[PDB]
Design a protein around this ligand. Structure first.
Ligand SMILES: NS(=O)(=O)c1ccccc1OC(F)F
Length: 435
């Protein structure tokens, strides 16, 4: 599978040994054939587990999640999906890798979709080989794939708020449970309910993942309350998954604003990945998967695919050519290649608003395309009254870089900048000119 012009999907079931067994064999063969190779990990947590599976082998780890002394003799680089896309966007030269390996290639974050688009286009061009490793490739319709040991699948009503009665099965469990919730705010409510009932709960989300995941190995716990981030290779020593089967969906309305629609059903790929956290030990059959809804193709019209197109339009490929999205996921957005291509100075602003401003791709694009410079924050306060960001049922206020107290009222409203307390605190720091 290492020959040029070939894109291979390694779709072995969850827990089949794609990372610990297959990946080191591919790396040895790539080193033997002198292929300049890139290994892409979804998160810093997967990069650390990859270093254990590849230990000894000459790999250059382009992440601070691993503390290794690189000899300078490595032809295999390892980095996160977001780092690969970020380096493509930045002026820095990225080697034209002969072999491109993506682990957890089902990741739907905009930078992962862009990385898939770029790589598959290089393969279509006949310039590279690629391997996409995932049990759930784009287009999967099977929510119940094979596992290392039989799983008990039970369709049941799953609580999405605190409860006083009616769900005895949840707390009448003596093992360890991983519970997938549609949002951080929904997880806070359930974790509070479980804590009041005497349970030890750990909460996981995109912004707290590396730090809080370590607690699942360093201490005893009864529940792990997590968003969809734990569908990306996160592994637990648990015997039950409780799955609300719901997620939030970012949606662009009238090309003017972004709302977080839902909670709505997850895709079959997400349901299979959430279920896949258990049934992994062949010596422990009978792990349970309790699910509270059906699946649907909620990736169609989801803002991440439009955001991936804004990223690929601003990545150099060859002269005026622009990378297409990976074919099985290209119909998820109505977008023409090149429509988001920015001129030099606006593109640099777009990259900085994402890299340093920490803004969502769509919002970074609106600011940069309007000809606004990175440090100009007047747009955070000159929007209509209905764009007022609310905190504790009262309009959010910040002190501007001028020393003036003003109501946070962005010219373009993206619900992701205030989806939880941590997001709004970061957006207030941005509006104030603190980064
Ligand atoms: N992939 S690797 O680092 O083992 C390698 C590949 C081709 C030549 C030399 C070499 O290593 C040596 F420099 F130590």
């Amino acid at each position: 599978m290492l020959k040029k012009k070939q894109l291979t999907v390694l779709d072995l079931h969850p827990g089949a040994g794609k990372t610990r067994r297959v990946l080191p064999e591919i790396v040895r063969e790539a080193i033997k054939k002198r292929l300049r190779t890139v290994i892409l990990a979804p998160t810093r947590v997967v990069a650390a587990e990859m270093e254990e599976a590849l230990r000894g082998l000459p790999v250059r780890y382009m992440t601070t999640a691993v503390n290794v002394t690189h000899s300078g003799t490595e032809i295999v680089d390892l980095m996160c999906h977001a780092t690969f896309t970020s380096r493509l966007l930045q002026p820095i030269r990225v080697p034209n890798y002969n072999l491109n390996i993506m682990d957890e290639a089902h990741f739907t974050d905009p930078s992962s979709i862009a990385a898939r688009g770029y790589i598959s286009t290089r393969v279509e061009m006949g310039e590279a080989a690629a391997i996409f490793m995932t049990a759930t490739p784009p287009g999967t319709r099977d929510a119940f794939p094979d596992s290392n040991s039989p799983i008990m699948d039970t369709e049941v009503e799953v609580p999405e708020r605190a409860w006083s009665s009616g769900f005895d099965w949840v707390t009448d469990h003596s093992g360890k449970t991983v519970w997938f919730v549609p949002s951080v705010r929904n997880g806070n409510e359930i974790a509070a309910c479980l804590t009041k009932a005497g349970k030890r709960v750990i909460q996981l989300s995109r912004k707290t993942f590396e730090t809080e995941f370590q607690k699942t190995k360093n201490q005893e716990w009864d529940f792990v309350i997590t968003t969809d981030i734990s569908e990306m290779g996160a592994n637990f020593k648990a015997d039950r998954v409780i799955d609300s089967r719901r997620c939030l969906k970012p949606v662009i309305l009238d090309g003017e604003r972004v709302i977080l629609a839902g909670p709505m059903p997850v895709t079959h790929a997400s349901a299979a990945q959430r279920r896949g956290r258990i049934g992994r030990n062949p010596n422990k059959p009978g792990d349970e998967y309790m699910y509270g809804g059906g699946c649907a193709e909620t990736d169609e019209g989801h803002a991440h695919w439009l955001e991936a197109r804004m990223l690929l339009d601003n990545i150099y490929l060859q002269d005026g050519l622009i990378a297409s999205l990976y074919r099985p996921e290209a119909d998820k957005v109505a977008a023409i290649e090149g429509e988001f291509k920015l001129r030099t100075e606006q593109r640099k602003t777009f990259v900085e608003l994402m890299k340093r401003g920490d803004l969502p791709v769509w919002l970074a694009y609106q600011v940069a395309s309007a000809g606004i410079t990175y440090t100009d924050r007047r747009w955070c306060f000159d929007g209509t009254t209905n764009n007022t960001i609310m905190e504790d049922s009262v309009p959010a206020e910040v002190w501007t870089k001028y020393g003036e107290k003003r109501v946070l009222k962005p010219r373009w409203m993206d619900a992701r900048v205030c989806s939880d307390h941590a997001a709004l605190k970061s957006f207030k720091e941005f509006a104030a000119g603190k980064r």
